[PDB]
Amino acid sequence: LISHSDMNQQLKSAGIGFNATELHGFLSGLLCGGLKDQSWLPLLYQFSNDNHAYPTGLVQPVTELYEQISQTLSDVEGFTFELGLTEDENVFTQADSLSDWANQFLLGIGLAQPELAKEKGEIGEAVDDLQDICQLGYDEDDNEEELAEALEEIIEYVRTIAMLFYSHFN
Amino acid sequence: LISHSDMNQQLKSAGIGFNATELHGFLSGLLCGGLKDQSWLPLLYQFSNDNHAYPTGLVQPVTELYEQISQTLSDVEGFTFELGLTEDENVFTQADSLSDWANQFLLGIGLAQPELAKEKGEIGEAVDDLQDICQLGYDEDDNEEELAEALEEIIEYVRTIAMLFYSHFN
């Protein structure tokens, strides 16, 4: 699998509407909502490229990423799924990235589960929590672990939500 | 059920080693680790009162709390379990309280599951995350939602962990 920076650059040079973090969230969202056929391709094209298919050479690593996401979620022995956020050290930039990831995960899972709004219990609470997370606002020049420590826990929670969803919907 | 402030005061006047938040965590920890008999009483007495039983009048509300915790975790329709933290508005004080809660939850669940250290996958990750949460350090005079927003998500994650544990161990 190509690196995050590598994917970011191939997507940008092809003029795709998603950066690598957004691609990771959208595809994880479709898989956690239980999508199992090849309809992820036309959905990806509709929502990230104005209905145009990706060029050859980009299609392959993107598809390898899809499969890697799918396999880790089918549980390569409990909890191997990773979010695929920015590698930027600025904690405020990691915050932004998690939010960025969350918007596309919510879009994907909602396309896969058109009646998600009806879910209650823990599934409904997680849906509400991800929606709050994509607008999680911070600031100041902190650059500290204060926000870092907190963020890492929120990240573990989002990984857990991704596992709970995949199980409920697969 | 008596209020949090009420329980805090009855525990303090009886010289008990736990405040109300700590009591809530310890009992939730024993129940999430699957304890099902009346051994929670001598364990509570050993770890919160130097092996002395609680006085009459305190024993009753404490036992009502135990039952309330047990019933909400058996899932009074998905996700009704609450942590029972401090009602103090200072976000830094809520942070401290969550940590306070987490130490006793970890003590309880570990007494109920003496081999918890061997768990891997998501259960092992949650155990590691709660252990990081009880030492979650913050500071400054922020008093903001910055930390508030983040804390609420961490709180939802701990509620979720409590549900995942109860299910794995009940």
Question: Which residue of A156, A158, A161 to mutate against B (max B Cβ within 10 Å)?
Answer: A156
Q: How many residues does chain B have?
A: 170
User: Shortest CA distance to A103 belongs to which of A138, A134, A69?
Assistant: A134
Helices B121-133 and A145-169 cross at an angle (nearest 10°) of 150
Q: Which among A79, A120, A137 is the nearest to B122, CB-wise?
A: A79
Resolution in angstroms for this experimental structure?
2.0
Which residue pairs from A141-148 have beta carbons closer than 8 angstroms and sit at least 24 positions apart in sequence? A142/A91, A142/A92, A143/A90, A143/A91, A143/A92, A144/A91, A145/A91, A145/B137, A146/B137, A146/B138, A146/B139, A146/B140, A146/B147, A147/A91, A147/A92, A147/A95, A147/B146, A147/B150, A148/A91, A148/A94
Q: Is A109 exposed, middle or buried (0-12, 13-18, 19+ CB in 10 A)?
A: buried
A49-59 core/surface letters (b: 16 or more CB in 10 A; e: else): beeeebeeebe
Nearest-angstrom CA–CA distance, B96 and B91: 9
To the nearest 10°, report the CA torsion of A109, A113, A115, A116.
-40
Q: How many residues does chain A have?
A: 170
The method of structure determination was X-ray
Say which DSSP state B16 is in.
-
Distance from CA of A55 to the nearest CA of B (A): 38
Task: Kindly determine whether residue A125 and residue B149, on different chains, have CB atoms separated by under 8 Å.
Answer: no
Instruction: Return the residue of B nearest to A137 by Cα.
Output: B146
Task: Kindly determine whether residue A133 and residue B125, on different chains, have CB atoms separated by under 8 Å.
Answer: no
Question: Which residue of B73, B122, B161 to mutate against A (max A Cβ within 10 Å)?
Answer: B122
Task: Kindly determine whether residue B126 and residue A160, on different chains, have CB atoms separated by under 8 Å.
Answer: yes
Q: Is A63 exposed, middle or buried (0-12, 13-18, 19+ CB in 10 A)?
A: middle
The CA radius of gyration of chain B, in Å to the nearest whole number, is: 16
Number of Cβ atoms within 10 Å of the Cβ of A83: 18
Distances from the Cα of A75 to the Cαs of A40, A81, A108, in angstroms?
20, 8, 20
Distances from the Cα of A98 to the Cαs of A70, A84, A161, B35, in angstroms?
20, 9, 14, 37
Number of Cβ atoms within 10 Å of the Cβ of A106: 19
Q: Which among B77, B132, B151 is the nearest to A121, CB-wise?
A: B77
In order of start, what are the domains of chain B with their CATH numbers?
Answer: 1-170 (1.20.120.740)
